[PDB]
Amino acid sequence: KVYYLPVTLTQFQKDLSEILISLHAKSFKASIIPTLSQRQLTYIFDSNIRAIANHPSLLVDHYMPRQLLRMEPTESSIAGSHKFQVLNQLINSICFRDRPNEVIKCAIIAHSIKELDLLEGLILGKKFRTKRLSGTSLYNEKHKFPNYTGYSKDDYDYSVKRNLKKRKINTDDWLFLATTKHLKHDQYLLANYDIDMIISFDPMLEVELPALQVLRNNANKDIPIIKLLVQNSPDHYLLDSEIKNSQEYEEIKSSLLYFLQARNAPVNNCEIDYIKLVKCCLEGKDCNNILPVLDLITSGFWQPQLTKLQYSSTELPLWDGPLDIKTYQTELMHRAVIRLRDIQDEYAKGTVPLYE
């Protein structure tokens, strides 16, 4: 059982996405039609669009310093991606759902170590027993998974029985964190924690896995999988190619081309319920709450365009020449600088209308 939730991006995600289209759209066009090579160009293009889709504060070529991860409000994290808001929404949907007695376990599959660091940075103060199944955990808590001498010479010591009625037990819903990398290198890491549902934050988990088919066969029912579905993306062409009924490089080029041609998606779906849908997933049923969009239909998209603001006058050079990683970072850097100057100086004068 596989399920899909249609999710889109936010404003600044589209801004930085068009920044990427300026820095790569000439080169990726040349790809379709030791600085770097076009293989590395298309791979970096693919990975950076997926990274901007997953909280664009990870686009920096630096690890988050791991003290600021737990020194930040949840809003500042979910202000980055739109996926984070829908994610945290379904999190609050399941922990504030109506609960007979269920101590329900789920596993969340991230793509790398950065994303999973953000995940433990989000749900640390929430009402879950969260366990990061990969090393270098962000504030690893010790939640363990399930499976009187007052006198002398005398001996009664009923303190043991006494203590049985005083000390209490935790009840937080279990939530497991790992990456599909380790789930490919190793196996059976999910076979042990018998979970009821898997939410795959990365929508390309390639579901029929030995560590996943052992759990699927182990289970009596069909285990429901949730793939967070971006509306149009360098994954969504291949997802289109799958849900129906070398080579990796050509697929990356084709799905990035489908995304660049499909970045101007006019129709988006909405009205996703969450508490009903999490109930649908809990009892392992196919209910119609998931949306059946499944695709969008296919020069003209190599030109970037930022959001046009009032008295703004910002433009892009589109870097119609070679590219090297240092030139790439300085270009991306001062482009984000002039974007910030535009957003600051643009906003800084609109007060006096409302004033008067």
Partner: protein, 48 residues
């Protein structure tokens, strides 16, 4: 206040968990009390 208080308690489960509400408004706080009459994390007081 019911809307507000339910937003504080639902949307801040990491720094606030018990509130006290006071009504020195000489009319009794009729609607506010029923919304939290079964509720234990909030201690409501009304002078009236």
């Amino acid at each position: 206040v019911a809307v507000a208080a339910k937003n504080i308690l639902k949307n801040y489960p990491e720094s606030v968990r018990r509130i006290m509400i006071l009504d020195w408004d000489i009319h009794h706080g009729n609607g506010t009390q029923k919304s939290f009459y079964q509720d234990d994390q909030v201690l409501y007081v009304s002078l009236h």
